[PDB]
């Protein structure tokens, strides 16, 4: 659920999942459309797509458990939906960390009309 993902993001990047990553670019937020603005926005688009592959799962509210193996994010065994939601989130947290150097504040609270074009998952 959102509580596990937010804690995951804070641990990995040092930044609070709100506000940094809830209104960033074209895909860090709610839904999304258009062409991702930068590497961090692509992390969100890939994250959205990953959730997209789990139709009878509820990613935002279904809680899972994960542990740290010295820095590594190991998803704990849970229901089949929890395991898969955890892997989509771990991937996003790592992707955000991988692109911290290009994170740009000018993409925070990005207007909707500038999100143009199309990208299929």
């Amino acid at each position: 659920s959102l509580l596990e993902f937010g804690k995951m993001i804070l641990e990995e990047t040092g930044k609070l999942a709100i506000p940094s990553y809830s209104s960033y670019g074209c895909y860090c937020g709610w839904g999304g459309k258009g062409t991702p603005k930068d590497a961090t926005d692509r992390c969100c688009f890939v994250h959205d797509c990953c959730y997209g592959n789990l139709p009878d799962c509820n990613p935002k509210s279904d809680r899972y458990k994960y542990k740290r193996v010295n820095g590594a994010i190991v998803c704990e065994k849970g229901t089949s939906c929890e395991n898969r939601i955890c892997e989509c989130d771990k991937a996003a947290a790592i992707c955000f960390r991988q692109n911290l150097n290009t994170y740009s504040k000018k993409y925070m609270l990005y207007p909707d009309f500038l999100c143009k074009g199309e990208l299929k998952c």
């Binding site: 804070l10 609070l16 999942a17 937020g29 996003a92």
Partner: peptide
């Protein structure tokens, strides 16, 4: 922690 993405 809190929430989004």
């Amino acid at each position: 922690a809190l929430v989004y993405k």
